[PDB]
Amino acid sequence: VDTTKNTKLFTSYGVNTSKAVSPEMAAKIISKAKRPLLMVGTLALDPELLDRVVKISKAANIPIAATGSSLAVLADKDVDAKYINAHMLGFYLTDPKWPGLDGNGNYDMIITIGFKKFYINQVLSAAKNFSNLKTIAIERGYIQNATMSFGNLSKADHYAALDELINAL
Amino acid sequence: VDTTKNTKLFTSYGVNTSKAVSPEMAAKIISKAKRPLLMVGTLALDPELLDRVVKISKAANIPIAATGSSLAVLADKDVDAKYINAHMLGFYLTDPKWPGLDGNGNYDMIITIGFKKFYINQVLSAAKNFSNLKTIAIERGYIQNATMSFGNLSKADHYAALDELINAL
Amino acid sequence: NAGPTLFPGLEGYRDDWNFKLLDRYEPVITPMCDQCCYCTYGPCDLSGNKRGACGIDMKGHNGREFFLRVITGTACHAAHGRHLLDHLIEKYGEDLPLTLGQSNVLTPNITISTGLSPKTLGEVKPAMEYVEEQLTQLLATVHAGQESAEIDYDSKALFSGSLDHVGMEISDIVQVAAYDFPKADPEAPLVEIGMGTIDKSKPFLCVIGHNVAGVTYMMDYMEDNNLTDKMEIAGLCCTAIDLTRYKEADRRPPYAKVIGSMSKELKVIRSGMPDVIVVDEQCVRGDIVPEAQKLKIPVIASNPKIMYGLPNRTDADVDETMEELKSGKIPGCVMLDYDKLGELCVRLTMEMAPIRDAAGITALPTDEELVNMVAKCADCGACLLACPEEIDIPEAMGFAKKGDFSYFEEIHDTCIGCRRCEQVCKKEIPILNVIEKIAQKQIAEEKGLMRAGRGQVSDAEIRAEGLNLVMGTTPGIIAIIGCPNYAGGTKDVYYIAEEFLKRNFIVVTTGCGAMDIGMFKDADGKTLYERFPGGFQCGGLANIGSCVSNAHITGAAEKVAAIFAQRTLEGNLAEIGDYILNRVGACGLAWGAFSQKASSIGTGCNIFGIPAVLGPHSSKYRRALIAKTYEEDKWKVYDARNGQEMPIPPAPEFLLTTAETWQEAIPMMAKACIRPSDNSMGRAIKLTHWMELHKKYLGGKEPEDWWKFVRTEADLPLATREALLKELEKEHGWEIDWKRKKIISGPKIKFDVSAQPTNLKRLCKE
Amino acid sequence: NAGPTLFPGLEGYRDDWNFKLLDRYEPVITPMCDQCCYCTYGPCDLSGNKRGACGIDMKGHNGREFFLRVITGTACHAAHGRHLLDHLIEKYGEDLPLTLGQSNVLTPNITISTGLSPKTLGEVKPAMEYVEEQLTQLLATVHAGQESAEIDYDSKALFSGSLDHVGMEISDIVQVAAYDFPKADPEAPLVEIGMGTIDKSKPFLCVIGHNVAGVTYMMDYMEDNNLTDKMEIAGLCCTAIDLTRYKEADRRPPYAKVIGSMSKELKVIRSGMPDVIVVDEQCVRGDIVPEAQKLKIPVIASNPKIMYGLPNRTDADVDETMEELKSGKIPGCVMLDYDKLGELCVRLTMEMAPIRDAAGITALPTDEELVNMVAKCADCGACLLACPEEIDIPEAMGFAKKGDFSYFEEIHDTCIGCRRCEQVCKKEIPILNVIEKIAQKQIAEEKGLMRAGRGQVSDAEIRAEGLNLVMGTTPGIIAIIGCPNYAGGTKDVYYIAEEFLKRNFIVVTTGCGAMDIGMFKDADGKTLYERFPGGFQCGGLANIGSCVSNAHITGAAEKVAAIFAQRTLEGNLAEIGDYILNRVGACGLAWGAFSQKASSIGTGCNIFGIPAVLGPHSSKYRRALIAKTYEEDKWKVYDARNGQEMPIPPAPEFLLTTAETWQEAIPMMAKACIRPSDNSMGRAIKLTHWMELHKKYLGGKEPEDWWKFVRTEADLPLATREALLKELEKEHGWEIDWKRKKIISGPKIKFDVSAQPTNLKRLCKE
Ligand code: SF4
Ligand code: SF4
Ligand code: SF4
Ligand code: SF4
Ligand code: SF4
Ligand code: SF4
Ligand SMILES: [Fe+3]
Ligand SMILES: [Fe+3]
Secondary structure, eight states: OOOSSOOOOSSOSOSOOOEEOOHHHHHHHHHHOSSEEEEEOSTTOOHHHHHHHHHHHHHHTOOEEEOTTTHHHHTTSSSOEEEOOHHHHHHHTTOTTOOOSSSSOOOSEEEEESOOHHHHHHHHHHHHHHOOOOEEEOSSSOOTTSSEEOOOOOHHHHHHHHHHHHHTO | OOOSSOOOOSSOSOSOOOEEOOHHHHHHHHHHOSSEEEEEOSTTOOHHHHHHHHHHHHHHTOOEEEOTTTHHHHTTSSSOEEEOOHHHHHHHTTOTTOOOSSSSOOOSEEEEESOOHHHHHHHHHHHHHHOOOOEEEOSSSOOTTSSEEOOOOOHHHHHHHHHHHHHTO | OOOSOSSOOTTTTIIIIIHHHHHHSEEEEOOSSSEEOSSTTOOEEOTTTOBOTTSOBHHHHHHHHHHHHHHHHHHHHHHHHHHHHHHHHHHHOTTOBOOOSSOSSOOHHHHHHHOOOOOBSGGGHHHHHHHHHHHHHHHHTTSTTSOOOHHHHHHHHHHHHHHHHHHHHHHHHHHHHHTTOOOSOTTOOEEEESGGGSOTTSOEEEEESSOOHHHHHHHHHHHHTTOTTTSEEEEESHHHHHHTTTTOTTOOOOOSEEEESGGGHHHHHHHTOOSEEEEOSSSOOTTHHHHHHHTTOOEEEOSTTOOTTOOBOTTSOHHHHHHHHHTTSSSEEEOOOHHHHHHHHHHHHHHHHHHHHHTTOOOSOOHHHHHHHHHHOOOOOHHHHHOTTOOOHHHHHHHHHTTOTHHHHHHHHHOOOOOHHHHHOTTOOOHHHHHHHHTHHHHHTOOEEEEOOOOSOOHHHHHHHHHHHHHSSSOOEEEEOSOOOOSSOSSHHHHHHHHHHHTTOEEEEEHHHHHHHTSOOOTTSOOHHHHSOOSSSTTOEEEEESGGGGHHHHHHHHHIIIIISOOOOTTOHHHHHHHHHHHOOEEEEETTOOSHHHHHHHHHHHHTTOOEEEOGGGGGGSEEEEOOTTOGGGSEEEETTTOOEEEOOOOSSEEEEEOSSHHHHHHHHHHHTOOTTOOHHHHHHHHHHHHHHHHHHTTSSOOTTGGGGOSSGGGSOSTTHHHHHHHHHHHHOOEEETTTTEEEEOOSSOOOTTOOEESOGGGSOO | OOOSOSSOOTTTTIIIIIHHHHHHSEEEEOOSSSEEOSSTTOOEEOTTTOBOTTSOBHHHHHHHHHHHHHHHHHHHHHHHHHHHHHHHHHHHOTTOBOOOSSOSSOOHHHHHHHOOOOOBSGGGHHHHHHHHHHHHHHHHTTSTTSOOOHHHHHHHHHHHHHHHHHHHHHHHHHHHHHTTOOOSOTTOOEEEESGGGSOTTSOEEEEESSOOHHHHHHHHHHHHTTOTTTSEEEEESHHHHHHTTTTOTTOOOOOSEEEESGGGHHHHHHHTOOSEEEEOSSSOOTTHHHHHHHTTOOEEEOBTTBOTTOOBOTTSOHHHHHHHHHTTSSSEEEOOOHHHHHHHHHHHHHHHHHHHHHTTOOOSOOHHHHHHHHHHOOOOOHHHHHOTTOOOHHHHHHHHHTTOTHHHHHHHHHOOOOOHHHHHOTTOOOHHHHHHHHTHHHHHTOOEEEEOOOOSOOHHHHHHHHHHHHHSSSOOEEEEOSOOOOSSOSSHHHHHHHHHHHTTOEEEEEHHHHHHHTSOOOTTSOOHHHHSOOSSSTTOEEEEESGGGGHHHHHHHHHIIIIISOOOOTTOHHHHHHHHHHHOOEEEEETTOOSHHHHHHHHHHHHTTOOEEEOGGGGGGSEEEEOOTTOGGGSEEEETTTOOEEEOOOOSSEEEEEOSSHHHHHHHHHHHTOOTTOOHHHHHHHHHHHHHHHHHHTTSSOOTTGGGGOSSGGGSOSTTHHHHHHHHHHHHOOEEETTTTEEEEOOSSOOOTTOOEESOGGGSOO
């Protein structure tokens, strides 16, 4: 699946925007991370995405930051997920001295999925302007404020792209 | 000269921006116009650009709207130039019933040159949002609010690009 | 006698209090845009915290932008107050007494900021002038080249927030007095609400706005002409709540109805039910005239703040203006004379009903039209990209093309009726009308009850609940307020209010929140207002009133400190906010906050030590106040008994933050009510509700940090005290005495019944 | 006796006047951004005049945005006024008389809006309260869901503009009275100005801001301690003009100096000359603290509107705070106590001078450092893209690399010292210091003279010039005011002022414009203030004062109508503005307008029928007022004698527009002074200057439309009357009587000495 052809936006935060990446590029970026974090939302998270979030966590062995009420459905799944409010997380990620969720420090790659675009773009606006933290959005929508992101995708293409990514981890 | 590789902007008016065109594309767009107008500024107009503004007017037989105090130097040149304030012109161009500078009506293609980028982008913001008027900027800078524009260019490349355009009219 | 801050200026609370609040609850800046377009040197790209041409950095500018929204909200409530005060003084005299019910501490917010305790309309003038004077000083600080430090814009914003509640208080007390609104009434009457409550056969006068003044003349004209049962009068936004508070002090049956929140404005218009629309000010759609016009609904602008470029007929004769409107010659007019407004609107309504019925108007598309326009959809994705709620319209269209309208039916309640989607549809499909047509069934069922705006919390209720709130045995005050820009539909506030009412918290609500809370019924067909008593009590649900009534929520908390704790109010905001932050469990919720007014209200709650959870769209305000729970030195206060530093638990962990879903919001709010001074039974109770709600809505496991709030075995939830003591020993290494089942070692914070936690050194005995 | 609008509300002038002005001078909307980010429903893409989620369209929002800048500017002058009024009343009493010079019509703007003619400080209170009350109502209209029609935001903006001049008037008259400022003095003393006028060997107290109150204590302390000749005290922005007006009513020699406009703020700091910096409010850079700190310059914040997050020492002992500052422990502090401020700043300055000299500081890079950093340039083009003036820095670097510093030397005067370029340079080259180092020679020559803020125009001057102005024989009033955000350097205002002074127009100036106008000298080494007399007279140049003094410019025009024409001022703005628009030739110029204050001032001039030309950056304000010269029905008024419609020439052709170059601005301003009621000699004279200036600056040929302003042969410029009559016959077909040389046919507008042109029907005899 081509996940880089559509980067349309309704409104813009300005001249700085994320680089659109393919499923294989995202896979390579994620595998190279030394201490990645899977930041999961709830409002755009459906059962199909939930299944893929679990496989990504496992295939790459990435801890999960269950934001919103995502832990509600991740709790009965075999993954390492811990609850944390997204706004708080977005703030903490900008603090070099944050012990992180397991106490072992901050992260070097944030992977976002399951969020409405307006909310994650806002939470991400902090790290974008006040940190050198790298972030990668793998939603069905183009996310301007991530370091890199998938472009806008039909639901089906999204599911396909995530499967291609998983097959590359 | 490649006039489409650099479209950097310091700030943005939003998601809508001009299409970058080559010297030959601009030449073809201008030749196809039935009633074009050459809108000339003063603050970014140098002697070299002045010479090229004259050749374009002649080669394509385009009337000139001498804005600012450009008529000061165009007056002693063999061209059809008439004074009109840029802000007023930007407003009038949005009125379908404007008799125009010669009394024969409005225009179907506005060619801008010799302006500071911030001023023309503002004057052009009216036509961009409140008219279906086509405009083409041929400055050394990328102009966001034109329908189409050259990208950012070194002074020399600008002079070269304008010469290529003239050779194509 | 008075505190140190009477009629304070911008810097009044800066060093003594605001900076202390801001050191713990740190400003979290999330820019809504990476640029600043305030002046001609710009626009400036501030990306990466760069500085503008003038020198201000990104954080400074965003502090400035949040500050601007706050003062804009502050000015709205104030302008509202000034107009009611002048009109009411002119009509009933300066000596009219402020009759607000059974209370001796009548105007807490006013008294705190000015030291004044006004008892009449005229006595409120000096407070109003103070607010207007300060707003001018505040708006001037928005000018380029003024403040540049983010933290100082935040202090200026907090100060403005205190001013907002002063202005809101002024607004509501003068109208409660002059218009005989309920007087701190636990039994204010239930009013019918919802688009489904309207009797379509009757003429319908629809009012949208905030200032109820002009509507009172409309109602007076209806009563005088025996029209209360012949026509319908219903409102959208606050004016709907205030108009149904009018002359209700004696609990007479309401004869008017309430349509709904701001989200219903375009929806009710598109339905075609209104025969006449009268707008006032604030939260009024900017496309009302052209939309009303399509269905031949005359529009009357009754407030100078919104004139829509309409012709002015304030000085014209009523009869003739009515002819101009009924004939459709003009789509509407401006009518600023209240004596003419009453008659004009009511009569035009009675007369428009037959005219519009004879017109043969079909507001929504027919069955055939619906199927056709749906089949026209190209699945281009434009609408979804333009939808503020990011609703998958293309998917709904897809399913509707094959007779499955379940998607569109569910969309109806989440859709805010803004029509951005329609403007981007190349096939020119009136998407909103598609949703509304398919939602007819659901709309007919939109019938609820809302208990009328009750007004203040009485001193009697403060005495009854004061101690309980402070010990913590009454788990806290839950305030559900604000706008309808929800991210997941309007039933969220209902589920939330219910969860808390069942766990016996004190729930109060106002504005659009109060409205939606009453839009749903249980298996027995009963509303929350019917299932729970209306007093300020545990397990009670009180609709305080319109948005200006939010001043009684901070007012109640302030009265706990003034009446229960007997603290001085006059010029003493810092001590009062500090007392609340340390000893009064509470948490606000503005799940659908959208307006500038919501930012000022929330900021006002914050300066009084009251945390607030906002919905996800609120992240767009640009500035949140969140504490770092992992930094030890952020959680220390003084013991006023000796001046020694003492540690406090991390509660609340924020003052202003956003939650993503309503399920997340609940446990967050419960936890937010935990206070340093909870006694043992209180803490045990608060920990019970929070730990239980966290398990219920977030996965079934306990909060990882639950142990951080345990000082002794007595703080432990009684039912599971055994298992918990095990966990403390097991997963934390605490020493337990299994004979008497108590804690020997482990807690980093000790229990001390006589401790006096305060963030203000000046209140300590050194 | 009074007009119809006493203490008007937002709608006061809407239908009677504003809408009439707006029908002719149409709002021209040029969005600065295609989006709106006011609330959480957004941001909304308004491109193509789409509507936001709330319903407001692009034009409505941009009207709203311009309106916001206007009220922000209005609040600035007002907040300023309120602080001076309270402080001055507290220090000198409410009964202090307003001593402003030889005038009986003391407060025209105030009287027009309130009907009041205050004679003391206390009597000004009611006007100040009115303004603050209206500002709250106006700020509330900026809230989402309020006004949506562009034209109504424009009316609200014009109204605010009238309020701005009321607030400015209040501000200046109270300080002129209490601080003994010049009293409408044509011989106010010349003050030295420019960074080159500073005696580097003396300690230097630099003040930046607007409110002069605190500076007066500084100066009082210097006089009391015989320091006026030992140290230098100079200011940037308005405070520089007001501090040099202090106790100058008796014309004593100035002992203080003026550095320059806001553009000099970073430049003077980078020079390292200041030993201490004291900031107040408005137009103060947001990066002063970190920049000052680099060169060990302590910063003192004396106004709560700008505290920079600095520690507060208002209640600390002076000696200790001085030790904290001189030791460099803290980069600065907040000092809000005026009694402590005076001593603290002056003493710290005397003491800092030696300390900083001993520090061995080299403010700018050495010769070697300059050559090295220049050689580091990569010609990446980043600085040019980020420069607000789009200065070709890469080219200058290129030439400087090979010893040609002519480019950098010319850049110095065009550069506004904003340092945006430095933040984007990957080679971390302090570009601004490169320009300043190379400009040392030029800076040493930056020495001029500025005639002190003179105050109001006296009634005597109004009587002397009234008739002349109205007939047109005195070509008009030229007001050069406003900010330094010029697009082509700061000498423009000089050339403009000169051209007009030589042609005998009445030239008045204020603020940064007044400053730069005096920064240049002719071949004889004389300034314009020296070459032309300071009275309000033909060929006269008067520096009215600081930006708040702009109120005396509209005040003078208002007094022409009140004194010459004997029109009533009280509650009669529309009649006065209408009179001015029809009979008083004038044109404002704000060539470098940047601030919100400039938009409000210009908008205030507009509502009084006074056109204004703004510099190109001003196009960023979003809304211009321009008339269509080609639409016949846009140029008709009534003849008050009979109520019949009558045609008027297209003059002025705009109320608020931008010009690109100073050469274009001149003829535009001259033409803008032509008025419908010019008598024959007046018109001939105005046509002479305009036609000549058009030929001189725009190509040598005559204005294509010059013939549109000729009613009879007597309107023709006398020297070229022959040739002109030829052209009218030749290129226009007019019938001439070559015997007496007059016009027989051709003019579409006749000359009528008794005609009474007015845009107000109510003033006509029907
Ligand atoms: S206020 Fe400052 S950051 Fe904003 S546009 Fe003006 S110069 Fe730029
Ligand atoms: S009307 Fe409803 S579906 Fe359309 S953009 Fe607004 S919220 Fe979305
Ligand atoms: S914008 Fe219109 S055509 Fe495109 S998917 Fe939406 S409803 Fe269909
Ligand atoms: S005020 Fe209106 S146009 Fe602006 S962001 Fe809010 S909804 Fe959009
Ligand atoms: S300091 Fe001067 S050269 Fe640099 S960006 Fe500002 S105006 Fe341009
Ligand atoms: S940004 Fe720096 S390196 Fe690039 S051209 Fe400008 S001065 Fe040279
Ligand atoms: Fe409301
Ligand atoms: Fe100024």
